[PDB]
Design an enzyme around this catalytic site. Structure first.
Site, short mmCIF file in Angstrom:
data_model
loop_
_atom_site.label_atom_id
_atom_site.label_comp_id
_atom_site.label_asym_id
_atom_site.label_seq_id
_atom_site.Cartn_x
_atom_site.Cartn_y
_atom_site.Cartn_z
N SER A 1 0.82 -0.89 0.25
CA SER A 1 0.12 -0.08 0.11
C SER A 1 0.85 0.84 0.01
O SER A 1 1.38 1.62 0.84
CB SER A 1 -0.62 0.22 1.10
N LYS A 2 0.54 1.88 -1.11
CA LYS A 2 0.76 3.42 -0.73
C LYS A 2 1.05 4.34 0.46
O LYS A 2 1.92 4.88 0.95
CB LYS A 2 0.66 4.55 -1.59
N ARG A 3 -0.08 3.64 1.64
CA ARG A 3 0.22 4.31 3.10
C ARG A 3 0.96 3.82 3.99
O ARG A 3 2.19 5.17 4.38
CB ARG A 3 -1.32 3.47 3.73
#
Ligand SMILES: Nc1ncnc2c1ncn2[C@@H]1O[C@H](COS(=O)(=O)NC(=O)[C@@H](N)CCC(=O)O)[C@@H](O)[C@H]1O
Ligand SMILES: Nc1ncnc2c1ncn2[C@@H]1O[C@H](COS(=O)(=O)NC(=O)[C@@H](N)CCC(=O)O)[C@@H](O)[C@H]1O
Lengths: 456, 489
Positions: free
Chosen positions: A212-214
């Site tokens: 995830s880019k998170r």
């Protein structure tokens, strides 16, 4: 047998993803090991989300990584056009043949073509790696093949283009395995031979979730900007689901090709530990000649960042040629050194500051084009909607982007360091400030959708 | 006016190559070059390396390079050649000997069997308020002699200054200067008159420090039957505190300002404004503009102040008037030439895991003066008063290095740590902060070699200023120790 032909079929919807490079590597390596060819097909069937810029970003990103294709939208080929948006006529006639053949029906005057799906039985698909996949036909939906606008869906265009482009093997993420029964059925309905299928494990974060880019940056072009060598990145991706003979940790593309065996691909979800990538890049940097390291640093700084724009920004503020380093240094760093205390929350509550950076990240993420005007309109609109003074709204952004309270105009700075680096520095700033709990974060995502389009 | 000149105008700058090239030499060179060009004349360069112990071949190249960078150029000199070559006084030794003898034959100079240091003792001798065949016999015996000029014992000397009018100096205040030393080589005073006459110099602009020497030169021109050039004594550049320009507060080296990012056009513009003002009071102007409107009488005689901060502001004005494209090219060219990047890449390679780390490790190579505080040096193992003592001696020792080579830096600092019996690891701790601005950096001795002599010394003296410096009395004791130290090379 038949001439081996593989492909990468990126959907040009957003940032170029490391995962797209992961698949592109194993398709190119597989093809070359078999004396075959690797082609690229742009799958811009989502007309609203597919942008011409996003297409150029993905081709540039893969070229930088060292991947190359014998046929594609740029190089051309005997199977042109290589954009699915320019193949709209081809798909429509085949969909109509499916209506005449008694293999498709219409569902509502506006109409959508839908495929017929057996109501009883099982679908047996042979996976090169997992063995055999059995799927009850009743769990396969009657997928839409042609939409109301007359444009194709993914499932119809993939079968037509793979067959016409003479693709013999397809390696793609295991997310697409549930769609496989639809693909076998469509090949039968057209009287075409389905390519052999190998579903690849999906890259994961350290927490074992999906990448995830998170949690970790996911853009290919971010790693270019951060100083990762393309040869190191491709080495790391080839090491994710796969191991060379003897478990060699550092290897070239040609080494991977010669000893490539599909059965050596592990089924566990590979973990993308950015720290391990960084160490490997250190090994690549140390094995370089000092002359090569110099030239690679200079090229990395001449291409990614625009120097004419940095000069214009610093000209009002430098009195000596030696001041350029202190005023323009942050343009060439990765993540400015920041602490929580740097965000003095003198104008905004700390909880406010987090909310500004989160919403700014999401809004700047979905920009069609990365221009200083679009940045300004987005941030001015956000300050307008909440009735905060813009100077007080931008105070956190000076810290996150430049690492100091004083710098050149922060919005031109964001335009210069680019979209990937701006968002990486904003997400970092949220993390230093503690972030927001899962409960608060979902509520903030709701407001983000309720927000206006600050650019219409 | 150019038309009211008896003879073709010819000016000169005559630098003594005995250290780093000083801004003052560029100041004087500017006003001789501008004056000559304004009058349709020519500007020449003569190297005055008569002090053999102090004159270095390296120091000669330093000044010629420094003036060319500043934009000065000369029609005749050691590099370009000329009809009066050689233009180094060390290579004109034959000429001075004969003219010194002609002064003995005319009875305008006498022999003294003293030697210059013995003469200083004789002049210091205490005396009451109110008061040669043998010499030739001593020359046969081979005793060493110095030729001295005769000076009238009574009367006054009138020197004509183009700016001050007439300067009168009692002959009693003029010593019988040595013209020829024991080695048979000239002193400054004899070589200046002989060379100015031979190179057909018509006007001389030089520091007002040389005004007390003017009576001697007038006398020599009379003794030789030569026409003395017109004299215009220039005010001396001063510090902000109104002292004579000193290295303590600001660097005095032309090449330091090159390395620090000052454009050559800005430096010459600033120097052209020091004792002088253009007509219409343009604060920013080019060299050719100065030539066109040049009037010698506009030179103020009050001591100009070399305010480094004002030089920086004017440089900023030059930077803002550049196109964004030109500013880009000037920044890059300034960074590609002075510092060699192959060595910086070599230094950071063991320490960088990302190309983006290069900026954090190599930034100090391109800064001017790293940001330092007193607190940055003190959480170490050494007392501050010690640290100051280390930095002052290191500055003086590194200043007098024949060549700036990493081995010579290494030997100098290693010997200094040995004489203090401080471990090298603790002795170099202050130098990491002064040169790189951090406690952790690339090896500082390679760093000093890379940034150069000017930048290393500028950063060390700055480190002294932040740490408060040492009092005048404390500094005298340290200079005594500097000479008492062995040769660490
Ligand atoms: N975390 C991850 N780890 C590892 N692979 C991942 C991935 N996320 C996406 N992928 C894989 O990346 C490839 C391209 O992704 S993409 O641009 O979204 N395009 C598509 O998904 C479609 N065009 C699929 C076409 C096909 O393969 O038949 C696709 O093969 C997709 O499965
Ligand atoms: N602070 C200052 N401000 C402004 N001018 C200054 C200066 N310090 C030195 N100068 C002047 O610089 C010129 C060259 O300096 S120097 O290398 O020491 N050489 C000499 O002084 C002599 N060889 C010059 C002989 C002559 O001109 O007749 C000389 O003209 C000298 O007077």
């Amino acid at each position: 047998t038949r001439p081996v032909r593989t492909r990468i079929a990126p959907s040009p919807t957003g940032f170029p993803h490391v995962g797209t490079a992961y698949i592109a590597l194993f398709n190119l390596v597989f093809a070359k090991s078999m004396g075959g060819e690797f082609i690229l097909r742009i799958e811009d069937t989502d007309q609203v989300r597919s942008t011409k810029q996003s297409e150029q970003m993905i081709l540039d990103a893969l070229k930088w990584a060292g991947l190359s294709w014998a046929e594609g939208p740029d190089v051309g080929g005997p199977h042109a056009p290589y954009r699915q948006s320019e193949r709209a006529d081809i798909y429509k006639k085949y969909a109509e043949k499916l209506l005449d053949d008694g293999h498709a029906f219409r569902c509502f005057k506006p109409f959508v073509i839908r495929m017929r799906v057996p109501s009883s039985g099982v679908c047996t698909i042979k996976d090169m790696l997992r063995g055999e996949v059995v799927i009850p036909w009743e769990q396969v939906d009657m997928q839409v093949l042609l939409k109301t606008d007359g444009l194709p869906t993914y499932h119809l265009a993939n079968v037509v283009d793979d067959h016409l482009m003479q693709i013999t093997h397809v390696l793609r993420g295991e997310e697409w395995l549930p769609s496989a029964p639809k693909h076998q059925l469509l090949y039968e309905y057209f009287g075409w031979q389905m390519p052999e299928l190998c579903h690849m494990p999906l890259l994961r974060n350290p927490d074992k979730s999906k990448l995830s880019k998170r949690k970790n940056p996911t853009s290919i072009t971010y790693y270019r900007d951060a100083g990762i060598l393309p040869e190191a990145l491709m080495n790391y991706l080839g090491r994710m689901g796969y191991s060379l003979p003897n478990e060699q940790e550092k290897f070239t593309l040609d080494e991977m090709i010669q000893s490539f065996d599909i059965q050596r691909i592990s089924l566990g979800g590979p973990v993308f530990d950015i720290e391990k990538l960084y160490w490997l890049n250190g090994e690549y940097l140390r094995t370089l000649s000092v002359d090569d390291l110099k030239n690679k640093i200079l090229a990395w700084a001449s291409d990614d960042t625009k120097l004419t724009a940095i000069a214009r920004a610093i000209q009002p503020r430098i009195n000596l040629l030696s001041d350029a380093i202190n005023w323009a240094g942050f343009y060439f760093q990765n993540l400015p050194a920041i602490t929580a205390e740097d965000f003095a929350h003198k104008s905004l509550d700390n909880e406010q500051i987090l909310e500004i950076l989160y919403l700014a990240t999401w809004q700047l993420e979905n920009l069609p084009i990365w221009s200083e005007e679009n940045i300004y309109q987005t941030l001015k609109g956000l300050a307008a909607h909440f009735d905060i003074k813009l100077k007080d709204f931008m105070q956190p952004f000076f810290v996150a982007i430049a690492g100091s309270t004083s710098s050149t105009p922060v919005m031109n700075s964001m335009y210069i360091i680019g979209a990937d680096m701006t968002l990486a520095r904003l997400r970092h700033a949220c993390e230093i400030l503690g972030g927001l709990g899962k409960k608060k974060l979902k509520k903030l995502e709701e407001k983000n959708k309720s927000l206006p389009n600050f650019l219409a």
